[PDB]
Design an enzyme around this catalytic site. Structure first.
Site, short mmCIF file in Angstrom:
data_model
loop_
_atom_site.label_atom_id
_atom_site.label_comp_id
_atom_site.label_asym_id
_atom_site.label_seq_id
_atom_site.Cartn_x
_atom_site.Cartn_y
_atom_site.Cartn_z
N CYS B 163 12.15 -1.63 2.91
CA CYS B 163 13.42 -2.67 3.23
C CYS B 163 14.53 -2.31 3.45
O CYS B 163 15.70 -2.92 3.92
CB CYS B 163 13.53 -3.47 1.70
SG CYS B 163 12.16 -3.81 0.68
N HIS B 298 20.42 -8.19 -1.42
CA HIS B 298 19.07 -7.65 -1.21
C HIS B 298 17.99 -8.79 -1.37
O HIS B 298 17.12 -9.18 -0.68
CB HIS B 298 18.58 -6.22 -1.82
CG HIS B 298 17.16 -6.18 -1.81
ND1 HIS B 298 16.61 -5.62 -0.69
CD2 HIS B 298 16.32 -5.94 -2.96
CE1 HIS B 298 15.33 -5.42 -1.05
NE2 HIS B 298 15.03 -5.63 -2.26
N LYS B 328 17.79 -14.53 2.32
CA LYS B 328 16.34 -14.23 2.37
C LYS B 328 15.60 -15.43 1.80
O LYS B 328 14.60 -15.94 2.09
CB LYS B 328 15.78 -13.05 1.58
CG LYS B 328 15.80 -11.76 2.04
CD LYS B 328 15.17 -10.56 1.47
CE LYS B 328 15.10 -9.20 2.22
NZ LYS B 328 16.61 -8.76 2.03
N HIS B 333 11.49 -12.11 4.15
CA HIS B 333 11.89 -10.56 4.14
C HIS B 333 11.06 -9.94 5.14
O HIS B 333 9.87 -9.91 5.52
CB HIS B 333 11.18 -10.05 2.82
CG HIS B 333 11.53 -8.77 2.51
ND1 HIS B 333 12.20 -8.10 3.62
CD2 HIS B 333 11.39 -7.94 1.33
CE1 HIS B 333 12.51 -6.84 2.86
NE2 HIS B 333 11.81 -6.84 1.56
N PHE B 390 17.63 -2.57 -0.84
CA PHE B 390 17.14 -1.78 -1.90
C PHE B 390 15.66 -1.63 -1.66
O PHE B 390 14.91 -2.69 -2.36
CB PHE B 390 17.46 -2.27 -3.23
CG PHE B 390 19.11 -2.23 -3.34
CD1 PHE B 390 19.83 -1.38 -2.94
CD2 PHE B 390 19.61 -3.51 -4.07
CE1 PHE B 390 21.26 -1.48 -3.21
CE2 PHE B 390 20.82 -3.38 -4.18
CZ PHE B 390 22.02 -2.52 -3.84
N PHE B 392 11.54 -0.68 -1.31
CA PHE B 392 10.40 -0.32 -1.96
C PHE B 392 10.10 1.25 -2.25
O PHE B 392 10.58 2.10 -1.16
CB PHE B 392 9.18 -0.98 -1.48
CG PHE B 392 8.04 -0.96 -2.15
CD1 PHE B 392 7.71 -1.27 -3.64
CD2 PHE B 392 6.75 -0.22 -1.74
CE1 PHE B 392 6.80 -1.08 -4.34
CE2 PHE B 392 5.85 -0.13 -2.16
CZ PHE B 392 5.69 -0.74 -3.58
C1 LIG Z 1 7.90 -6.10 -4.50
C2 LIG Z 1 8.90 -6.06 -3.53
O1 LIG Z 1 9.90 -6.67 -3.77
C3 LIG Z 1 8.54 -5.25 -2.14
S1 LIG Z 1 9.57 -5.05 -1.03
C4 LIG Z 1 8.61 -4.28 -0.08
N1 LIG Z 1 9.13 -3.81 1.34
C5 LIG Z 1 8.46 -3.21 2.03
C6 LIG Z 1 9.05 -3.02 3.55
C7 LIG Z 1 8.29 -2.22 4.37
C8 LIG Z 1 7.31 -1.53 4.17
C9 LIG Z 1 6.82 -1.35 2.96
C10 LIG Z 1 7.50 -2.00 1.79
N2 LIG Z 1 7.62 -3.87 -0.54
C11 LIG Z 1 7.33 -4.34 -1.92
C12 LIG Z 1 6.11 -4.33 -2.61
#
Ligand SMILES: CC(=O)c1sc(Nc2ccccc2)nc1C
Lengths: 404, 404
Positions: B163, B298, B328, B333, B390, B392
């Site tokens: 993110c 975020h 968002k 997202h 913020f 992952f």
């Molecule tokens: C549970 C959550 O909020 C999120 S945010 C996110 N973002 C990204 C972005 C780009 C590549 C990989 C992951 N992954 C997860 C599981």
């Protein structure tokens, strides 16, 4: 401005699973290339690879390894080695806002991406995919999977730039030191080895295909009958540290990073321009008041690429070119891991006072004539070394490292 | 130290194909989320997405677009917009060692990784894979596919950090200016939208599944009945420029980047720690002598993440919350594209004097009391704005932007 030194290193490569094994292979001119039944079975024309010869099962705690693809496993083991080599205790480097991690891969994990899509397309759908594919497949997997278990509080991200990936990671680590933002940045990268990714390179005609019956002869930078690179996997990590911080803790210092070039060709997607490489080398040499004693070339064993780089070297160095060898003739091309692994080979040459041979040159290319392409292991007291990484997409990195 | 300003912007988002459409959506609180038959057909539980509503056919020359995945297409279109907005002629930014590009994606191209593997397993093998999959699939595709056609000669690489990807790209562009290495860096990112990647998020339970019949209500940051994020795609690009350079050419300047935080949680792999976010925000605020007027959170619409960020905001600001909204809830997202797109929404709020609403809060979370979460478009003169990313894997970026 603040100076950056390398105070530890770690490596998992086709030519050894730690720096002792790597050093022995470099001195012996030993190939890390083997025949791959996996690549042959996939229908590829290239059946050779620089594989990591290590059973990684059980080497990483389950709560940590469950998130990881092979790129992250190799980078993680390299990082553990680098921390031990640097003599850093957890008290020193964990939960410390001035300690960061910049480490990447060129490809992420094609294997796990394809696994997720294949699983999703079968009858069990999401249940077959399971909950761990994102950290395996995302482009930042190598940094994410390491920053947590090592309790990193400073910078944490991945750079990618194809073959230049982990060289730009090291240069960006130097920048964090120069900006005064970090005292230590672990820098490096990892790359998995799999038909899922390799077939993309074979489809562009980039891989060696004529030497499958003699795998150790396939990677042959500067040889007249080279026919493409040999793909490889692995990882590496170096500890980039601000000089006063290193001196204050009695660090063992391999070298200072006295130059970092990063440029762009703005020309061709897959072939180097030369002009960008000249600017990159000159940028890394600017202000460096000592000659380059040894240059670890990008030298992938490609017809066009090998000699484009040599023409750039002649332009940069005029009538005083350095000793050169292409360690990819032994190791293959580990893509996102190449920059850091080749920085490490160069640092081992500097530390132990030798030049590793450029192997498999049965007939030197006419365009390499007059250069000191070293073909036998040579003891030499080196002081300053250079390592080039010139990636697809016209992205270039050069590092210059010098004894303190 | 050299100062960095934003002199142009470009965007292709779920809420608009250029900054005029995006501005209107932000003022209207208009959702970009729609039902996706593709996601449903793939077997997913989440059937909603923030799609780019634009026929891209013929917008990019054939010899350029043949190398590109959708993340690169969206980033390329955004870059064209940014160049025009910045008033940069080809002669001003092409073939210029002082002009660079730092732009990334979170996932690269899962679609093309899977395409290559599927093609290789079919009757045409390498001929079905074709010669363009590496540039589509590799982690650095977005930077590689833009740096060539735009003739970029300076820095050229991708950062990935889930993110936080394109926010770290902007911060690293600022660092190039601060180090005196570049005069202009195009910074941003792109993300494709596809079941191949989305299903990996649904398999870990990260995506909204309970609101498929009412897509515009699925993304609902801070609402008590939120149930995961809504995946989106698109691109964004900003022109980061050294201040004196910008003024000397008569640039229009949106804002100065007065703060950039980048930190790491070093903690629970899958949840934000809260503390890393606190450290990141404070790092971005260090030395900034004006209050934060507006914070673009975020806030992805996840149970744990939304209130962890609110707790971090409370720690940083105490009883003097900025105005906050989670865009968002409108946009979904967009992963690698989110940092630059949200920097752009924040710059548009700063430039046009309004706060975009945090939509779909029907019941505010029990843990969101005592802050200023703005739920209706509010005209207000802003001077300093903050945007959080913020990511992952515990990777955090915060940008603070301020009028000159
Ligand atoms: C549970 C959550 O909020 C999120 S945010 C996110 N973002 C990204 C972005 C780009 C590549 C990989 C992951 N992954 C997860 C599981």
């Amino acid at each position: 401005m603040k100076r950056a030194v390398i105070t530890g290193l770690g490596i998992v490569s086709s030519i050894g699973n730690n720096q002792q094994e790597v050093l022995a292979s470099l001195r012996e001119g030993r190939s890390g290339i083997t025949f791959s039944q996996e690549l042959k079975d996939s229908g590829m024309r290239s059946h050779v690879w620089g594989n990591v010869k290590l059973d990684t099962t059980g080497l990483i705690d389950r709560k940590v390894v469950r998130f990881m693809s092979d790129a992250s496993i190799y980078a993680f083991l390299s990082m553990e080695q680098a921390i031990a080599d640097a003599g850093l205790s957890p008290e020193a480097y964990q939960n410390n806002p001035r300690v960061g991690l910049i480490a990447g891969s060129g490809g992420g994990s094609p294997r796990f991406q394809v696994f997720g899509a294949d699983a999703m397309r079968g009858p069990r759908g999401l249940k077959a995919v399971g909950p761990y594919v994102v950290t395996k497949a995302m482009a930042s997997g190598v940094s994410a999977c390491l920053a947590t278990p090592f309790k990193i509080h400073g910078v944490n991200y991945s750079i990618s730039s194809a073959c230049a990936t982990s060289a730009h990671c090291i240069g960006n680590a130097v920048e964090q030191i120069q900006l005064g933002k970090q005292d230590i940045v672990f820098a490096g990268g990892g790359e998995e080895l799999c038909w899922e990714m390799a077939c993309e390179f074979d489809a562009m005609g980039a891989l060696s295909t004529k030497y499958n019956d003699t795998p150790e002869k396939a990677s042959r930078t500067y040889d007249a009958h080279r026919d493409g690179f040999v793909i490889a996997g692995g990882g590496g990590m170096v500890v980039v540290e601000e000089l006063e911080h290193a001196l204050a803790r009695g660090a063992h210092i391999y070298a200072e990073i006295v130059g970092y070039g990063a440029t762009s060709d703005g020309a061709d997607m897959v072939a180097p321009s030369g002009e960008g490489a000249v600017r990159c080398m000159k940028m890394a040499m600017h202000g460096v008041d000592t000659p380059i004693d040894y240059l670890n070339s990008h030298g992938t064993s490609t017809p066009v690429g090998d000699v484009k780089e040599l023409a750039a070297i002649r332009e940069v160095f005029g009538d005083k070119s350095p000793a050169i060898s292409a360690t990819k003739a032994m190791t293959g091309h580990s893509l996102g891991a190449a920059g850091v692994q080749e920085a490490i080979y160069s640092l081992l040459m500097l530390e132990h006072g030798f030049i590793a041979p450029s192997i498999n040159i049965e007939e030197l290319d006419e365009q390499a004539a007059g250069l000191n392409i070293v073909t036998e292991t040579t003891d030499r007291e080196l002081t300053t070394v250079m390592s080039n990484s010139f990636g697809f997409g016209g992205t270039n990195a050069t590092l210059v490292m010098r004894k303190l």
